[PDB]
Design a binder for this molecule. Structure first.
Ligand SMILES: *[P@@](=O)(CCCCCC)Oc1cccnc1-c1ncccc1O
Ligand SMILES: *[P@@](=O)(CCCCCC)Oc1cccnc1-c1ncccc1O
Lengths: 315, 315
């Protein structure tokens, strides 16, 4: 069932709870963010060297959107294939600094450029603000490819949990509005359905790092009181038509509330005739893709994600 | 639906049929083999350079089994991670020379050693002869790892169509007999069920390179008249228990009679808690993995398979 390394980390977390570490769901949103942001930074493996890191901003829909570009070791070409990466944290926590090590590694193994986006967070900017920025970021980089050292032909989106949701909504938004969408979508244990509780959401609601308590706390902040839970920007799995979506890589963990909706999305793409890789990492938890200081499986996962995307773009 | 490159190749094949090229199913097995073996060789992309090719043999269960080792460019280590590769051809056609380009490329992209096996073919050696060699080959290389420059910890099996079937049976055989099986299984559009006709087997029985006519012609030669079609060496999908099988990569083509049984096997592994990558290449046909002179998708497929296996073994 659980890998030894996964069991060991859940035990260390339980030890810290009994030790007197507060629950994230007990703190106010702004205070809990600062606290968890430092713990996330410290859970990622030591950041590898890349060719070049660039830090900048551009005009968003209703604020400045900050980004970080990562140029991989050994790639001298001007315009590189590019992954636009949306960090996770339930549209409330996380930022560019929390997913830095992961992004550096993706860049090096894929031989692609990675552009990490810093979208607006709830509760200060609730739904639909974080998705509006993610879409604004894709459009800005698509239409200014050369500014970002990006090859417009080979421009990909991706992310983890809420960032995975964001990546999936960006493709659906671009398809539904008739414009040029990404060339590839990388969904790391994404959130694709708010309308229903799957078997995994019920089964792994307690004691597997991402709990129901956490998900309610994010929900409190992200969603204005009376919203249709079946809105495709909250629940992209309920989309009517999956044709004309870009080729997809989808990853799930075994002990992740989100496993079943992750795999359902993959099934919807496969049956609609979209080129699609699907991988399940059983015996590990939500977060493992960036908990790489404690979880070796996370590093192997980054490498599988990077490798598949390099194979698609011929890097 | 069909990619332009797939449509173009099926049209050239149809042109040659109307042109007066005989059907493979009309020729005797030995004559058809010689004819198709030269066409296969000529359908593979130009063979890349590798560090070193070794050609040799060893004592099989009831004959000499020939093998070819491919050491990849840039890998100086004595003992490498190793893929034991079983060519396809319905246990009747194919050999080391037909899958040479593919094997060289897998070796280079994966950073792994590849060992191509030359197993006994039907009708001269019918069922269960080709599987007996495949199993004998794995055991010989496992128990003489250093002789073959193989790291025993990281010793993988794989193959395409009949070779895919063989790879899957080798893992089931090693599990059922209680011994140390492969550490990874790479199934390229494998044959996993003889007991039933799926939707894909009926839908793509005519006009997609691999036809029912071809499959009956292989079957005529491979299977002695009265065999239980539900024998796990013919139908490894009907296995009762999938626990204790190695992590798997499984690849299917959209227009492949074998798609549905390929995907079913993947589903069985995922539900049993085996780490498992599943990829569908829609808009291309059975054989595309080695028809790489005409089909660019085949080259992208080799790279995805190589990349996933490199990520697993940390090459
Ligand atoms: P994701 O954004 C999960 C939220 C899905 C529900 C949509 C409203 O959360 C992540 C992602 C990556 C790494 N960590 C976390 C995380 N860490 C600590 C506590 C909670 C979460 O969600
Ligand atoms: P595979 O071994 C398909 C046979 C599955 C049925 C089991 C008895 O056939 C292949 C594999 C790779 C490349 N080519 C071919 C092939 N080429 C030409 C004609 C027929 C076939 O099967």
């Amino acid at each position: 069932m659980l890998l030894p390394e996964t069991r060991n980390l859940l035990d260390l977390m339980d030890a810290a709870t009994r030790g007197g570490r507060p629950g994230l769901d007990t703190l106010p949103h702004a205070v809990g963010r600062k606290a968890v942001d430092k713990m996330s930074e410290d859970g990622e493996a030591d950041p590898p060297e890349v060719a070049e890191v660039a830090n900048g901003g551009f005009a968003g829909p209703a604020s400045e959107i900050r980004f970080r570009r990562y140029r991989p070791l050994g790639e001298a070409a001007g315009l590189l294939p590019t992954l636009i990466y949306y960090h996770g944290g339930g549209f409330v926590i996380g930022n560019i600094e929390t997913h830095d090590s992961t992004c550096r590694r993706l860049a090096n193994k894929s031989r692609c450029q990675v552009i990490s986006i810093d979208y607006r967070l709830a509760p200060e900017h609730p739904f639909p603000a974080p998705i509006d920025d993610g879409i604004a970021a894709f459009r800005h980089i698509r239409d200014n490819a050369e500014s970002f050292g990006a090859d417009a032909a080979r421009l990909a989106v991706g992310g983890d949990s809420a960032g995975g949701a964001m990546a999936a909504v960006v493709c659906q938004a671009c398809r539904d509005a008739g414009e040029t969408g990404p060339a590839f979508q990388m969904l790391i244990y994404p959130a694709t359905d708010s309308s229903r509780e799957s078997a995994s959401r019920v089964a792994f609601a307690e004691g597997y790092f991402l709990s129901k308590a956490h998900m309610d706390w994010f929900w409190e902040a992200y969603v204005p009181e009376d919203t249709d839970l079946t809105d495709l920007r909250l629940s992209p799995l309920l989309a009517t038509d999956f044709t004309g979506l870009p080729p997809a890589f989808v990853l799930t963990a075994g002990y992740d509330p989100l496993r079943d909706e992750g795999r359902a999305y993959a099934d919807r793409l496969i049956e609609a005739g979209i080129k699609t890789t699907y991988v399940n990492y059983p015996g590990t938890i939500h977060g493992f893709f960036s908990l790489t200081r404690f979880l070796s499986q996370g590093l192997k996962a980054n490498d599988e994600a990077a490798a598949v995307m390099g194979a698609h773009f011929g890097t």
